[PDB]
Amino acid sequence: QSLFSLAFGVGTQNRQEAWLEVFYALPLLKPSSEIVAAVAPILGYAAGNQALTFTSQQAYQLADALKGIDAAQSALLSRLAESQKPLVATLLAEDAAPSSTAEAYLKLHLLSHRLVKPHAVNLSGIFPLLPNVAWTNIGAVDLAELAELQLEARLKGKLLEVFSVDKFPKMTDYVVPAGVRIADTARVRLGAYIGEGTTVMHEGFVNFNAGTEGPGMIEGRVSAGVFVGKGSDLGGGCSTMGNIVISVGEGCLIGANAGIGIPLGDRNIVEAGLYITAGTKVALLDENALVKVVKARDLAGQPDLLFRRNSQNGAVECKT
Amino acid sequence: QSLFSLAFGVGTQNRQEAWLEVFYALPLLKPSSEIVAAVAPILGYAAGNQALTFTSQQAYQLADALKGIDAAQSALLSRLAESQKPLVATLLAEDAAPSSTAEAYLKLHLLSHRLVKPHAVNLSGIFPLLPNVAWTNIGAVDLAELAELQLEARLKGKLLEVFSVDKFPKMTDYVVPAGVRIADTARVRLGAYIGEGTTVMHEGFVNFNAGTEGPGMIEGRVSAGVFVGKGSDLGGGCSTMGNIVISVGEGCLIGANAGIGIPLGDRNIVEAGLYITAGTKVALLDENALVKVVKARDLAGQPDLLFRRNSQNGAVECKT
Amino acid sequence: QSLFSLAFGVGTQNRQEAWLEVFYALPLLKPSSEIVAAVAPILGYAAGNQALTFTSQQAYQLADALKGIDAAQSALLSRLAESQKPLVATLLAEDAAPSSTAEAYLKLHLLSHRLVKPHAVNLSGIFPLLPNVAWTNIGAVDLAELAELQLEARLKGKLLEVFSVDKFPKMTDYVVPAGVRIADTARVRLGAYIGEGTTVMHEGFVNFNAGTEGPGMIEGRVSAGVFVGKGSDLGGGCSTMNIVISVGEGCLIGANAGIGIPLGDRNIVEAGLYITAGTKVALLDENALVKVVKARDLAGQPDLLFRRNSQNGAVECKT
């Protein structure tokens, strides 16, 4: 059938052969049937969603099979054939809950290469497939092996720098999409979608399955599942809630340290320091005369609203 | 006597023989007198709190003295004999105000290894014993020597990366305790206690002599001296105060960008955005009828409190 | 005329001979005419603001022209002579709008080396001259080139770590000024001015053309153009933002506070309080009410204590 996705990866395994991570240089969404037919017999792929380990020899074969069909992939395979690290072919017949770590990594790659957008893909059950890993300067290292490797580096006057201990590596160690700035890359997870024209500044954060249409200036905290529309600036220290699908529309503005726990419609402005939850009582104002006191949940998705705290009596107000 | 602690360390010295840092693989709290009597004569240890430099030969001899008593410490010492860097034995009669950099480093390891909790160890005067150092990809570097190594690195088209300039290195460059996640390890200082079941997210920060019993979700800032009880979740960019001892009890919830300048008893909730210091006048409420106006200090360490801001008139309230 | 600046730089080029960055070890402000008199003709400098690429040969001649004149610079050039990277001599006649990346970098170094203070130097138009680059453990890398090198590292079980993708690099990969602590150096841009006695903690941030007089404790966000006077502490996650927003001497800014007006000396601001020009504040005296003004009219005033009333949510200023 028409496969959902396929990618040839080079990854890391621990001493018991558990996959810790996979690097895919050139993942493909909706690969052509020609590529799939050319590669399936060599890998032993028949059907379904499979993570298939392949040898250096198979890499040479696959590189030949795709000379004539896809040069970019062929060229990748020739490099992969000389790898000092294990290779895996991830062929997905369908977009379903991931069943292996390799697949988990592939889907996070589809997001960060921008080939798919937040919510587009099934990520259910991803957490148990992504091992807790020490991310270090020499690569992913198993937690049960790390202590020894740390000591060993010290004996040489070197340092094994461990810059993250988590289930998700930082995005930019796998892919840097075009038209993007990320001041401090520890704050953008693999699986984040950083739209063309987005600057993530140092206080900005973007989790997996979340991000920006682009352009925009992101200095706040975009949580898992939160998408942000084009031309929307997030002030330093602000937050989106990590239930209805939270999002930020196009043209929006979000002051520093502000917190939004409901969807914001296009062209919304939010005041610095202000917090809005679903049950936040707001005074709805007009052209600014009072109308009525409603909960923020009932303004969810509305365009051109301006959320500000009244500095004199502390009342939260929405000027239409 | 019953030593308070001992540890065999490999460290780094500058050109004038001042210690910059020490790495202890296997620090011991209350070592057995068997180990001490096996080690003391070979080092020249009589009494007191001493940081004794030892030679490669002594390392062999110490391993040889501890084969049969403690095989882990023995295995460690034989690795240290093959070191390219200077060794130090730190034997402490008593938990006292630190007198050497080696001793300052050891006490920080006792915390981060979870062998003692915050407040259990004496850290008075630690700041002048911890040199201000440049932490780089090649290790710790004396600030006076740094410019030369920076320039020289550039001449080869390489980079000497300088990721911190401080008295406290990051905990994970020394130890990753079991059952822990720390998304950005630059925000956890050596000397932090990160309990089993803790997830420090990217905005989470944990200073020395501070941290979590575990489990927990730390997306806020745990200041020095601040301990956080089990099952207590700190929101995005919230703060504790770094006087009475500021702590957070068990099963607490602290909302994003809230501040707590008073100790919180068990099962306390604090609303996101609310800032409560000792002299914060709170409208104590009941099963939500009013009662009186008290200062937050008087409600310190009380169980099952709910601190919030009135979104209609700005008043700070506590709901029992 | 008298040169405003000169520095001998080592840099990184991509394949279309574009300059990604330059590392100046010993930048000189107002270099003696002696030093200049020796170096200009060997390089072919006539006048104006010039970034003259120069060779390994010239480095030997320029070390020789400065033997007996400036020992630090002579030693610098003998090392540059052995460089495996393209070298640039950056001679500036005046402090004018930057025109090249070499010059842009240099102007950031003058700030970070503390040789000039924020606002004292012309950076108009610097943004386009600072190419967007992946900052990696191996050095600055062209974005167009990065994917190949990322792959190649992985084939050897290595990692090409990309720790920043920005037009500015982190200050500390170029210079660490004396008497300074910076917990997380990803949060201080080349171009920042971190004055003696400053500790920037982990939640602290300083942009370029901004910083601290020193001494100070900066746990908050210091935006471009913002300068913080001596003895002023900034709390965790606090923010500074047209009038040039400054913080005076001996100020205290609470956690997550926001100052959108210039703060006079010895001002205290409560944690979580967000004050902008339009913020309406209950002005209190010696604490009886006096009137309600906008914060803009309290801008620059010394000895003010800003706090939010916990009983009615009013912003209050106690004089």
B16 and B135 in a single domain? The answer is: no
Residue C222: its H or E element: strand C221-222
Question: Rounded to an integer, what distance in angstroms lies between the CA atom of residue C1 and that of residue B62?
Answer: 70
Catalytic positions of A are 219
Do residues B248 and B254 lie in contact, with contact meaning Cβ atoms separated by under 8 Å?
yes
Question: How long a stretch of residues is chain B?
Answer: 320
Do residues B238 and B220 lie in contact, with contact meaning Cβ atoms separated by under 8 Å?
yes
Strand partners, A159: none
Question: Rounded to an integer, what distance in angstroms lies between the CA atom of residue B6 and that of residue B310?
Answer: 54
Q: Using a CB-CB distance cutoff of 8 angstroms, which residues of chain B are in contact with residue A143?
A: 176, 178
A67 and A135 in a single domain? The answer is: no
Diameter over CA atoms, chain B: 76
C115 and C187 in a single domain? The answer is: no
A122 and A138 in a single domain? The answer is: no
Question: Rounded to an integer, what distance in angstroms lies between the CA atom of residue B239 and that of residue B254?
Answer: 9
**Pairing, β A205-206 against β A180-182:** unpaired
> In B155-173, which positions are buried (b, 16+ CB within 10 angstroms) versus exposed (e)?
beeebbbbbbbbbbbbbbb
B163 and B180 in a single domain? The answer is: no
Question: Rounded to an integer, what distance in angstroms lies between the CA atom of residue B277 and that of residue B239?
Answer: 11
Peptide bond into C215 cis (omega under 30): yes
Helix (H, G, I), strand (E, B) or coil at C23: strand
Q: Cβ–Cβ of A163/B174 closer than 8 Å? A: no
**Pairing, β B269-270 against β B253-254:** parallel
Considering CB atoms only, which of A164, A186, A259 is closest to B256? Answer: A259
Which CATH number belongs to the domain containing residue C215 in this structure? 2.160.10.10
B181 is known to lie in a ligand binding site: no
Do residues A172 and C147 lie in contact, with contact meaning Cβ atoms separated by under 8 Å?
no
> What are the distances in angstroms from CA B12 to CA A119, B9, B19?
49, 10, 6
Do residues A295 and A282 lie in contact, with contact meaning Cβ atoms separated by under 8 Å?
yes
> In C238-266, which positions are buried (b, 16+ CB within 10 angstroms) versus exposed (e)?
bbbbeeebbbbbbbbbbbbbbbbbbbbbb
Peptide bond into A215 cis (omega under 30): yes
Strand partners, C238: none
Q: Which partners does chain B have (≥3 C-beta pairs < 8 Å)?
A: A, C
Q: Which of C17, C219, C249, C316 is catalytic?
A: C219
Structure tokens at C156: 């050897």
CB atoms within 10 A of CB C287: 10
Diameter over CA atoms, chain C: 76
Question: Which residues neighbour B179 within 8 Å (Cβ) at sequence distance 6 or greater?
Answer: B196, B197, B214
Interface probe with A: pick from B141, B176, B253, most Cβ of A within 10 Å? B176
The closest of A61, A10, A16 to A40, measured between CA atoms, is: A61
**Pairing, β A221-222 against β B180-182:** unpaired
C250 and C179 in a single domain? The answer is: yes
Question: Which residues neighbour C291 within 8 Å (Cβ) at sequence distance 6 or greater?
Answer: C283
Number of alpha carbons in the 13 Å side-chain half-sphere of residue B151? 19
Give the technique used to solve this structure: X-ray
CB atoms within 10 A of CB C64: 14
Q: Cβ–Cβ of C312/A311 closer than 8 Å? A: no
Structure tokens at B123: 């850290």
Helix axes A71-80, C143-155, angle to 10 degrees: 40
Helix (H, G, I), strand (E, B) or coil at C191: coil
Strand partners, A13: A19
Question: Which residues neighbour A221 within 8 Å (Cβ) at sequence distance 6 or greater?
Answer: A204, A205, A237, A238, A239, A240, B203, B236, B237
Which CATH number belongs to the domain containing residue C155 in this structure? 3.30.60.70
Structure tokens at B39: 């080690």
Considering CB atoms only, which of B139, B257, B313 is closest to A158? Answer: B139
Q: Cβ–Cβ of B85/A154 closer than 8 Å? A: yes
**Pairing, β C193-194 against β C205-206:** unpaired
Number of alpha carbons in the 13 Å side-chain half-sphere of residue A82? 9
Cα torsion C224, C226, C230, C236: sign = negative
Question: Rounded to an integer, what distance in angstroms lies between the CA atom of residue A122 and that of residue A112?
Answer: 15
The amino acid at residue C285 is D
Residue that terminates a domain, selected from B77, B103, B129? B129
Considering CB atoms only, which of C154, C186, C280 is closest to A202? Answer: C186
Do residues C10 and C27 lie in contact, with contact meaning Cβ atoms separated by under 8 Å?
no
CB atoms within 10 A of CB C114: 17
The closest of B311, B314, B278 to C282, measured between CA atoms, is: B314
Question: Rounded to an integer, what distance in angstroms lies between the CA atom of residue A24 and that of residue A105?
Answer: 8
Residue A229 region, left (φ>0) first, then alpha (ψ -120 to 50), else beta?
beta
Do residues B206 and B194 lie in contact, with contact meaning Cβ atoms separated by under 8 Å?
yes
Do residues A227 and A118 lie in contact, with contact meaning Cβ atoms separated by under 8 Å?
yes
Query: How far is CA A284 from its chain centroid?
Result: 36
Strand partners, C164: C135
Helix (H, G, I), strand (E, B) or coil at C233: strand
C297 and C234 in a single domain? The answer is: yes
DSSP B48: S
Question: Rounded to an integer, what distance in angstroms lies between the CA atom of residue B73 and that of residue B91?
Answer: 14
Q: Which partners does chain C have (≥3 C-beta pairs < 8 Å)?
A: A, B
Task: Please provide the DSSP assignment of chain A as one string.
Answer: ---SEEEEEEEEE-TT--EEEEEESS-EES--HHHHHHHHHHHT--SSEEEEEE-HHHHHHHHHHTTTT-HHHHHHHHHHTT-SS-EEEEEESS--S--SHHHHHHHHHHHHTTSS-TTSS--TT-GGGS--EEEETTEEE-HHHHHHHHHHHHHTT----EEEEESS-BGGGT---SSEEESSGGGBBTTEEE-TTEEE-TT-EE-TTEEESSSEEE-SEE-TT-EE-TT-EE-TT-EE------EE-TT-EE-TT-EE-S-B-TT-EE-TT-EE-TT-EEEEE----EEEEEEGGGGTT-SS-EEEE-TTT--EEEE-
Question: Rounded to an integer, what distance in angstroms lies between the CA atom of residue A217 and that of residue B46?
Answer: 62
Q: State the smallest CA–CA distance between residue A311 and chain C in angstroms.
A: 6
The amino acid at residue A315 is A
Question: Rounded to an integer, what distance in angstroms lies between the CA atom of residue C6 and that of residue C37?
Answer: 12
Helix axes B56-66, B71-81, angle to 10 degrees: 160
**Which residue's structure tokens are 């956080």?**
B228
Question: Rounded to an integer, what distance in angstroms lies between the CA atom of residue B173 and that of residue A136?
Answer: 10
Q: Cβ–Cβ of B186/A163 closer than 8 Å? A: yes
Query: How far is CA B72 from its chain centroid?
Result: 24
Q: Cβ–Cβ of C134/A176 closer than 8 Å? A: yes
Query: How far is CA B63 from its chain centroid?
Result: 29
Helix axes B33-43, B56-66, angle to 10 degrees: 150
Q: State the smallest CA–CA distance between residue B55 and chain A in angstroms.
A: 14
Q: State the smallest CA–CA distance between residue B159 and chain C in angstroms.
A: 5
Question: How long a stretch of residues is chain C?
Answer: 319
The closest of C235, C224, C305, C310 to C265, measured between CA atoms, is: C305
B73 and B141 in a single domain? The answer is: no
Question: Rounded to an integer, what distance in angstroms lies between the CA atom of residue C142 and that of residue C137?
Answer: 13
DSSP C295: G
The closest of A95, A109, A93 to A24, measured between CA atoms, is: A109
Do residues B65 and B24 lie in contact, with contact meaning Cβ atoms separated by under 8 Å?
no
Q: Using a CB-CB distance cutoff of 8 angstroms, which residues of chain A are in contact with residue B85?
A: 154-155, 157
Interface probe with C: pick from A149, A176, A201, most Cβ of C within 10 Å? A176
Q: Cβ–Cβ of C154/A181 closer than 8 Å? A: no
> What are the distances in angstroms from CA B260 to CA A259, B14, B241?
18, 41, 7
Q: Cβ–Cβ of C272/B277 closer than 8 Å? A: no
Q: Using a CB-CB distance cutoff of 8 angstroms, which residues of chain A are in contact with residue C187?
A: 184, 202
Residue B293: its H or E element: strand B290-295
Question: Rounded to an integer, what distance in angstroms lies between the CA atom of residue C222 and that of residue C209?
Answer: 10
Peptide bond into B31 cis (omega under 30): no
Question: Rounded to an integer, what distance in angstroms lies between the CA atom of residue C50 and that of residue A11?
Answer: 48
Question: Rounded to an integer, what distance in angstroms lies between the CA atom of residue B252 and that of residue B227?
Answer: 12
The amino acid at residue C24 is Y
Which CATH number belongs to the domain containing residue B123 in this structure? 3.30.70.2010
Task: Give the resolution in Å.
Answer: 1.8
Question: Rounded to an integer, what distance in angstroms lies between the CA atom of residue A221 and that of residue B185?
Answer: 18
Helix axes C71-80, B143-155, angle to 10 degrees: 40
C124 and C151 in a single domain? The answer is: no
Strand partners, C165: A182, C134
CB atoms within 10 A of CB A178: 8
A47 and A155 in a single domain? The answer is: no
The parent domain of residue C248 ranges over 171-319
Question: Rounded to an integer, what distance in angstroms lies between the CA atom of residue B207 and that of residue B168?
Answer: 9
Q: Using a CB-CB distance cutoff of 8 angstroms, which residues of chain B are in contact with residue C272?
A: 257-259, 273-275
Structure tokens at B17: 């023989």
DSSP B246: P
> In A61-81, which positions are buried (b, 16+ CB within 10 angstroms) versus exposed (e)?
bbbebbeeebeebbebbbbbb
CA dihedral C42, C44, C50, C51 (to 10 degrees): -50
Q: Cβ–Cβ of B147/C84 closer than 8 Å? A: no
Considering CB atoms only, which of B79, B138, B174 is closest to A158? Answer: B138
Chain B residue nearest residue C272, CA to CA:
B275
Question: How long a stretch of residues is chain A?
Answer: 320
CB atoms within 10 A of CB C270: 22
Query: How far is CA C96 from its chain centroid?
Result: 18
B316 and B283 in a single domain? The answer is: yes
Helix axes A143-155, B71-81, angle to 10 degrees: 40
The amino acid at residue A135 is W
Q: Using a CB-CB distance cutoff of 8 angstroms, which residues of chain A are in contact with residue C258?
A: 256-257, 272-273
C63 and C182 in a single domain? The answer is: no
Q: How many domains does chain C have?
A: 3
The closest of B120, C186, C161 to B108, measured between CA atoms, is: B120
Q: Using a CB-CB distance cutoff of 8 angstroms, which residues of chain A are in contact with residue B311?
A: 280-282, 315-316
Phi, psi of C113, rounded to the nearest 5 degrees:
-70, 0
The closest of C164, C160, C188, C163 to C176, measured between CA atoms, is: C188
Strand partners, B180: B198
> What are the distances in angstroms from CA A285 to CA A316, B311, B313, B314?
10, 16, 16, 18
Q: Please classify residue A47 by burial: count the beta carbons closer than 10 Å to its beta carbon, then call 0-12 exposed, 13-18 middle and 19+ buried.
A: exposed
Do residues B277 and B261 lie in contact, with contact meaning Cβ atoms separated by under 8 Å?
yes
Cα torsion B276, B278, B284, B287: sign = positive
Q: Cβ–Cβ of A185/C162 closer than 8 Å? A: yes
User: H helices of C98-184, where?
Assistant: 101-112, 143-155
Q: Please classify residue B152 by burial: count the beta carbons closer than 10 Å to its beta carbon, then call 0-12 exposed, 13-18 middle and 19+ buried.
A: middle
Do residues C244 and C300 lie in contact, with contact meaning Cβ atoms separated by under 8 Å?
no
